[PDB]
């Protein structure tokens, strides 16, 4: 019998050597002993990239979103992470050969490049028209968040409460009112921000890092100039993210390997993050929301403020 040099999963990790913990959506890992866990957590997140050869949007529109769907894809990723937490739990992990829960395929199906899927590129681009965005027009964080909120209305399976806190202010009373509607609808809290004109004041960095250190952390969408990313954590002075900027063929059945980024997580200097972002948090229960509020209070400078009315 042959003995192989079995190249273990996390053997391909390219992490820098200065061991500050590694945070991924509310979970802290040691780059020294938890390489496997880090990579599993990263690869488990639903990854959405450019796709080609999907049904022509609107019947006569694009059959690929390469070059224009990047922020829509980041929007898909952060919203999908919310659905993953809502349906599978934050502790769920994907495995290439392990049979996944049917609820997993229901989440993935919602983002497949099909007209009838709740959050497909087709649905987002078309719904975006209503927000004043032509098909193929670039989006900013808030816009995609607003589109996802409208699309979530039709997703009676998830029955989410989607609150997009505008004006740097999170109004708890409005959040409670929305969640207690038709007793608590899981909350997807999105906070679109503009932390500076061209850069982010270093004073917000500590606060930004902490946005990835909460149990409810959904991460952040934004990016480098002309490069939108879905940031899921950080290590040292670098953000960790999933990049949609790779065109992959539309999936033809659901084979799901292309929806999982099984490579060392991308990293970029926190300093390079553009000020236009959207921070996300998921609060499944009212107690989760209360805890989140408490965690925010605990927090150099704030990125947004929590208020009652």
């Amino acid at each position: 019998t042959l003995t192989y040099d079995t190249l273990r999963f996390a053997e391909f990790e390219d992490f820098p050597e200065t061991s500050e913990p590694v945070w991924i959506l509310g979970r802290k890992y040691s780059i020294f002993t938890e390489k496997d866990e880090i990579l599993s957590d990263v690869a488990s997140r639903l990854w959405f990239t450019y796709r080609k050869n999907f049904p022509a949007i609107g019947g006569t529109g694009p059959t690929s979103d390469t070059g224009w769907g990047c922020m829509l894809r980041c929007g898909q990723m952060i919203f999908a992470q919310a659905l993953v937490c809502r349906h599978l739990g934050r502790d769920w992990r994907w495995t290439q050969r392990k049979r996944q829960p049917d609820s997993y395929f229901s989440v993935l199906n919602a983002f497949i490049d099909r007209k009838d899927s709740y959050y497909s590129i087709h649905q987002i681009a078309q719904m975006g028209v209503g927000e004043g965005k032509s098909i193929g027009q670039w989006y900013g964080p808030n816009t995609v968040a607003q589109v996802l909120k409208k699309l979530a209305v039709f997703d009676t399976w998830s029955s989410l409460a989607v609150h997009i806190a505008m004006d740097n202010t999170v109004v708890m009373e409005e959040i409670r009112r929305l969640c207690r509607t038709s007793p608590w609808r899981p909350l997807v809290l999105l906070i679109p921000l503009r932390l500076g004109l061209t850069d982010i004041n270093e004073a917000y960095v500590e606060t930004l890092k902490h946005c990835f250190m909460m149990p409810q952390s959904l991460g952040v969408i934004g990016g480098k100039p002309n490069s939108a990313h879905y940031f899921i954590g950080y290590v040292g002075e670098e953000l960790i993210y999933l990049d949609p900027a790779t065109t992959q063929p539309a999936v033809e059945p659901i084979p799901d390997e292309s929806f999982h980024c099984q490579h060392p997580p991308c990293r970029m200097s926190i300093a390079e993050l553009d000020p236009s972002i959207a921070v996300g948090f998921f609060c499944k229960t009212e107690d989760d929301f209360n805890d989140w509020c408490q965690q925010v209070k605990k927090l150099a400078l704030p990125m947004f403020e929590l208020v009652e009315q």
Partner: protein, 116 residues
């Protein structure tokens, strides 16, 4: 041309002296679209006389209204490159710590960068 480019420093200093005298309880504020902002429209009037009791939250709502924005549309008001730490902050306080050397309080508004 921005407000500062259309009126000299001395001219603006005089503008403020005149307005602060005629309206001691009003704060002279110049609100313009950030130079790198292109999504949000431009105001018909960029010179504002704001009661000193008004806070940022209130001012923001007014500017949003002027711009005829939907609450759904991203809008941010930045002073000296940053959004005020607290929206409950009275304009009188912002004026005290952020006003320009010419006497005016300057602010620019922007939405968000887009990506494709």
């Amino acid at each position: 041309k921005t407000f500062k480019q259309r009126r000299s420093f001395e001219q603006r200093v005089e503008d403020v002296r005149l307005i602060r005298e005629q309206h001691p309880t009003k704060i002279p504020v110049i609100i313009e679209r950030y130079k790198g902002e292109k999504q949000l429209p431009v105001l018909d009037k960029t010179k504002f006389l704001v009661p000193d009791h008004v806070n940022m939250s209130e001012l923001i709502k007014i500017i949003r209204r002027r711009l005829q924005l939907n609450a759904n549309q991203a809008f941010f008001l930045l002073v000296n490159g940053h959004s005020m730490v607290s929206v409950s902050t009275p304009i009188s306080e912002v004026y005290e710590s952020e006003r320009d050397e010419d006497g005016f309080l300057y602010m620019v508004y922007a939405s968000q960068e887009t990506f494709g």
